[PDB]
């Protein structure tokens, strides 16, 4: 059958799980009877973003109440929703509009996964697992448990778990070394920058076929800048628990996936409060939201010339900021080089 190693086989199955894709859409309150997985279109999603962009403008700029109603009706007609025996809420407040922009970010990845899964299964000689694997265009290898890399990664997970994020425990089930096709070449010029760190990136399991085949992506130009704190960029953290919260796991579904990527930060543009940034000031390569807590600088190590902030959660002293923990944002897709994929087990405490 499958030529792949057991853990990789189980990773592929989890990634392309159809039931999970539907569960995600249901959580987003989408009407699966009026809009099944097969109906999802790229241009459909793209248009929904532009509708959200306009309605966001109308609300913030004091638009006519009739325009907001019109935009609301157009949005729900485009993407059928199921609100029960409840009245459909209008897209009239920035927080609901924000929630909808994020639904679209996820649908963009779900659509990719379903499209990959659906076509190209014309072999027979090759096992279905192998075929889907090749669709990812990503070389995946299991990292040795009693390795030096693994030891360093486990230390990073254990030491960087946030204090306020103790609604669960975390166990590293498997660590995979991943290499997306052509990504190392895309990232090559940034090897010239200083301050290259190994940072975390959490996401729903349903987003991984898109992340692996397309890479980490920045929100589309049609998207409202408002739906993203520090503008439209790629977000990372130095505390495993801050990113792990973005996996959206539960006690009924405790297995999450998280990435470790080498990110070329260079000279950081340090911010204490949110800012819908459009472009970097001269001499800046990234943004750094300052948090009240961050890893112990004395404990910072190296893994292939890349800094690994694995020290224990220490008080930064920059205790006059909005953020409780740091945030790292890059506005160039080529400034990131994915290295590891970890399969985590969230042990929700009672
Ligand atoms: C889920 O949609 C959004 C929208 C805006 C910002 C974000 C957002 N994601 C992260 C992550 C991460 N994903 O690992 C880490 C640190 C800060 C972050 N902010 C997510």
UniProtKB/Swiss-Prot annotation:
Please name the catalytic residues of this protein: 327 (for poly [adp-ribose] polymerase activity)
Q: Where in the cell is it found?
A: Chromosome; Nucleus; Nucleus, Nucleolus; Cytoplasm, Cytosol
Per the database record, which ranges form the PARP catalytic domain?
127-350
What PTM annotation applies here?
Poly-ADP-ribosylated on serine, glutamate and aspartate residues by autocatalysis. Auto-ADP-ribosylation on serine takes place following interaction with HPF1. Auto poly-ADP-ribosylation on serine residues promotes its dissociation from chromatin.
* Domain PARP alpha-helical span(s) in chain numbering: 1-118
Q: Which GO terms describe its molecular function?
A: damaged DNA binding; NAD binding; NAD+ poly-ADP-ribosyltransferase activity; NAD+-protein mono-ADP-ribosyltransferase activity; NAD+-protein-aspartate ADP-ribosyltransferase activity; NAD+-protein-glutamate ADP-ribosyltransferase activity; NAD+-protein-histidine ADP-ribosyltransferase activity; NAD+-protein-serine ADP-ribosyltransferase activity
- Asked if the keyword Protein biosynthesis belongs to this entry, the reply reads no
The record lists NAD(+) as bound by 201-203, 210, 217, 243
Q: Name one GO biological process term.
A: DNA ADP-ribosylation
Q: Which domain of life is it from?
A: Eukaryota
An annotated GO cellular component of this protein is:
nuclear replication fork
Region forming the signal peptide: none
- What family is this? Belongs to the ARTD/PARP family.
What does the record note on quaternary structure? Homodimer; PARP-type zinc-fingers from separate parp1 molecules form a dimer module that specifically recognizes DNA strand breaks.
- Comment, domains: The two PARP-type zinc-fingers (also named Zn1 and Zn2) specifically recognize DNA strand breaks: PARP-type zinc-finger 1 binds PARP-type zinc-finger 2 from a separate parp1 molecule to form a dimeric module that specifically recognizes DNA strand breaks.
What name appears for this protein in its UniProt entry?
Poly [ADP-ribose] polymerase 1
User: Can you name the source organism?
Assistant: Gallus gallus
Q: What is the lineage of its organism?
A: Eukaryota, Metazoa, Chordata, Craniata, Vertebrata
Gene name in the database record: PARP1
């Amino acid at each position: 059958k499958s030529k792949l190693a057991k853990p990789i086989q189980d990773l592929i199955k989890m990634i392309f799980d159809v039931e999970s894709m539907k569960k995600a859409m249901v959580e987003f309150e989408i009407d699966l009877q009026k809009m099944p997985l097969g109906k999802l279109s790229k241009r459909q999603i793209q248009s929904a973003y532009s509708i959200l962009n306009e309605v966001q403008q109308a609300v913030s700029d004091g638009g006519s109440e009739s325009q907001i109603l019109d935009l609301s009706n157009r949005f729900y007609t485009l993407i059928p929703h199921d609100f029960g025996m409840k009245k459909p809420p209008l897209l009239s407040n920035l927080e609901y509009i924000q929630a909808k922009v994020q639904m679209l970010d996820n649908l963009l990845d779900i659509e990719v996964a379903y499209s990959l899964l659906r076509g190209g299964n014309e072999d027979g000689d090759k096992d279905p697992i192998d075929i889907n694997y090749e669709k990812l265009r990503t070389d995946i290898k299991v990292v040795d448990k009693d390795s030096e890399e693994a030891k360093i990664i486990k230390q990073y997970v254990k030491n960087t778990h946030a204090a306020t994020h103790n609604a669960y425990d975390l166990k590293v089930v498997e660590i995979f070394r991943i290499e997306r096709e052509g990504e190392s070449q895309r990232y090559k010029p940034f090897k010239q920058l200083h301050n290259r760190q190994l940072l975390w990136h959490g996401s729903r399991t349903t987003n991984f076929a898109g992340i692996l085949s397309q890479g980490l992506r920045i929100a589309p130009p049609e998207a409202p800048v408002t739906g993203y704190m520090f503008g439209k960029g790629i977000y990372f953290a130095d505390m495993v628990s801050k990113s792990a919260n973005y996996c959206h796991t539960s006690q009924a579904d405790p297995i999450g996936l998280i990435l470790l990527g080498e990110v070329a930060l260079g000279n950081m543009y340090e911010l204490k409060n949110a800012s819908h940034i459009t472009k970097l000031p001269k001499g800046k390569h990234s943004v750094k939201g300052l948090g009240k807590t961050a890893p112990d600088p004395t404990a910072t190590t190296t893994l292939d010339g890349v800094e690994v902030p694995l020290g224990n959660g220490i008080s930064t002293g920059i205790n006059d900021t909005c953020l409780l923990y740091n945030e790292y944002i890059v506005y160039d897709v080529a400034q990131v080089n994915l290295k590891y994929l970890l399969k985590l087990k969230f042990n929700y405490k009672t």
